[PDB]
């Protein structure tokens, strides 16, 4: 019998799977019975990092801007009483309204159109019938697919008033991300970002999840490079102009250890304490990076409003 690590439980049944009208272009895994991607299988095992063409950069700018618009739709719905399923429904419609496919939907049979990660959920939480509670923290992770390209971002949000521990965890996590982004430029080793993130997390009494990493993204949802967020990692590769990847630190109040729910997706702290995450998709430029998933109409993430 599965022993839950914290207070959270899945709230079933799920509403029937939401359809995407056929005029929306679909990634290859959308119609695979196990949600496997033939294009991913063909590239599996590569450590070759794509140098994006100008056409690819235009494709990544567009899908990442639309992904930010969809996260912003989700951010507007965060309040006590709203279920994660209701947020996912709004996200699904917002994706379709922008002629995008919701990348998570049927990815290895993932059942929903975004990931909603409350409290002790590290990542990949499945939207369900649980209403958000005053005091919760919730990550919404949006991945969209447009014209052959995926874009990926996430923010952690407060549900009503939260305690000082929630404030410190979310603020430190956001700082970890911005300190890592600020280091991105040609010639920096991908393994260096984890030293920066862990140094800031540890300084604030938090741990860094080891089982999940930032990743290459463009024609595949994940590919080279692998970008760990913890110190002294063995990530292979050196940043060059035209590289596109995510940085998405998952930081925990307690220990770093994770386990998975019987659903096969929900990653939780083994100790049941809270975890927060922020994510941007980055394009390395000749001298810095472009934050493809940046908020355009505000300097700050939603939790600071
Ligand atoms: C590199 O992996 C990724 C990782 O470590 C960070 C967290 C995820 C969710 O992005 C990841 O786990 C993905 C890409 O494998 C997961 C499949 C994606 C969805 C939306 C279900
Ligand atoms: Co993501
Ligand atoms: Co990601
Ligand atoms: Co995969
Ligand atoms: K969380």
Q: Kindly give the distance from the C-alpha atom of residue 283 to the centroid of ligand 5, in angstroms, as a whole number.
A: 26
- Distance separating alpha carbons of residues 9 and 105, to the nearest angstrom: 22
Q: Kindly give the distance from the C-alpha atom of residue 79 to the centroid of ligand 4, in angstroms, as a whole number.
A: 32
CB of 66 sitting under 6 A from ligand 1: no
Token pair for 187: 């010639």
- Distance separating alpha carbons of residues 181 and 60, to the nearest angstrom: 18
User: What sign results for the dihedral spanned by CA atoms 194, 198, 199, 200?
Assistant: positive
- Distance separating alpha carbons of residues 241 and 193, to the nearest angstrom: 17
**For residues 200 and 172, is the Cβ–Cβ distance under 8 A?**
yes
Angle between helices 164-182 and 192-203 (to 10 degrees): 150
CB of 216 sitting under 6 A from ligand 1: no
Residue 141, CB-side half-sphere exposure with 13 Å CA sphere: 30
* Backbone interruptions in the chain following residues (C to N > 2.5 Å): none
**For residues 290 and 68, is the Cβ–Cβ distance under 8 A?**
no
- Distance separating alpha carbons of residues 91 and 78, to the nearest angstrom: 12
Task: Give the Å distances, CA to CA, from 36 to 31, 43, 84, 117, 179.
Answer: 9, 13, 25, 23, 35
Cis peptide before 225 (omega within 30 of 0): yes
CB of 221 sitting under 6 A from ligand 1: yes
**For residues 116 and 14, is the Cβ–Cβ distance under 8 A?**
no
First to last CA, the chain: 42
Residue of the CA atom closest to atom 18 of ligand 1: 104
- The DSSP secondary-structure symbol of 63 reads H
Relative to the CA of 104, which ligand 1 atom is closest? Answer: 20
Phi-psi region of 265 (alpha: psi -120 to 50; beta: other; left: phi over 0): alpha
CB of 213 sitting under 6 A from ligand 1: yes
Residue 81 sits at the vertex; the CA angle it makes with 107 and 206, to the nearest 5 degrees, is: 65
Task: Give the Å distances, CA to CA, from 138 to 25, 108, 117, 141.
Answer: 30, 23, 5, 10
- Distance separating alpha carbons of residues 202 and 94, to the nearest angstrom: 38
Q: What is the CATH number of domain 1-305?
A: 3.90.230.10
Q: Provide Rg for the chain, Cα atoms.
A: 18
Residue 282's nearest CA partner among 243, 229, 236 is 243
The secondary element (H helix, E strand) that includes residue 276 is strand 275-277
Contacts (Cβ under 8 Å, ≥6 apart) of 264 = none
Q: Which of 47, 123, 220, 228 has most ligand 1 atoms within 8 Å of its beta carbon, as the pocket-test mutant?
A: 123
- Distance separating alpha carbons of residues 28 and 38, to the nearest angstrom: 7
**For residues 256 and 208, is the Cβ–Cβ distance under 8 A?**
yes
Residue 213's nearest CA partner among 203, 223, 202 is 223
Token pair for 124: 């990949």
């Amino acid at each position: 019998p599965y022993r839950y690590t914290g207070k959270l439980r899945p709230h079933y049944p799920l509403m029937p799977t939401r359809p995407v009208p056929s005029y929306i272009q679909r990634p290859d895994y959308a119609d695979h019975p196990l949600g496997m991607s033939e294009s991913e299988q063909a590239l599996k095992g590569t450590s070759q990092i794509k140098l994006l063409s100008s056409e690819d950069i235009e494709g990544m700018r567009l899908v990442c801007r639309l992904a930010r618009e969809v996260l912003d739709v989700a951010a507007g719905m965060i309040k006590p009483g709203v279920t994660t399923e209701e947020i996912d429904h709004a996200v699904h419609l917002a994706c379709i309204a922008r002629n995008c496919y919701p990348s998570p939907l049927n990815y290895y049979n993932f059942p929903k159109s975004c990931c909603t990660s409350v409290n002790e959920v590290i990542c990949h939480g499945i939207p369900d019938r649980r209403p958000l509670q005053e005091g919760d923290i919730v990550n919404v992770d949006i991945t969209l697919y447009r014209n052959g390209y995926h874009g990926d971002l996430n923010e952690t949000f407060f549900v009503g008033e939260v305690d000082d521990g929630a404030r410190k965890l979310v603020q430190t996590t956001y700082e970890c991300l911005m300190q890592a982004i600020d280091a991105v430029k040609p010639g920096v080793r991908y393994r260096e970002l984890g030293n920066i993130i862990q140094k800031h997390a540890q300084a604030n009494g938090f741990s860094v999840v080891r089982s999940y990493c930032g990743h290459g993204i463009h024609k595949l949802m994940h590919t080279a490079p692998n970008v760990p967020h913890y110190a002294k990692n063995k990530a292979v590769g050196v940043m060059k102009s035209g590289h596109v990847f995510t940085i998405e630190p998952m930081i925990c109040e307690g220990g770093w250890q994770d386990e998975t729910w019987p659903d096969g997706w929900t990653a939780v702290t083994r100790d049941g304490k809270r975890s927060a995450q922020f994510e941007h998709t980055l394009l390395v430029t000749d001298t810095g990076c472009e934050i493809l998933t940046r908020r355009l109409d505000s300097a700050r993430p939603h939790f600071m409003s």
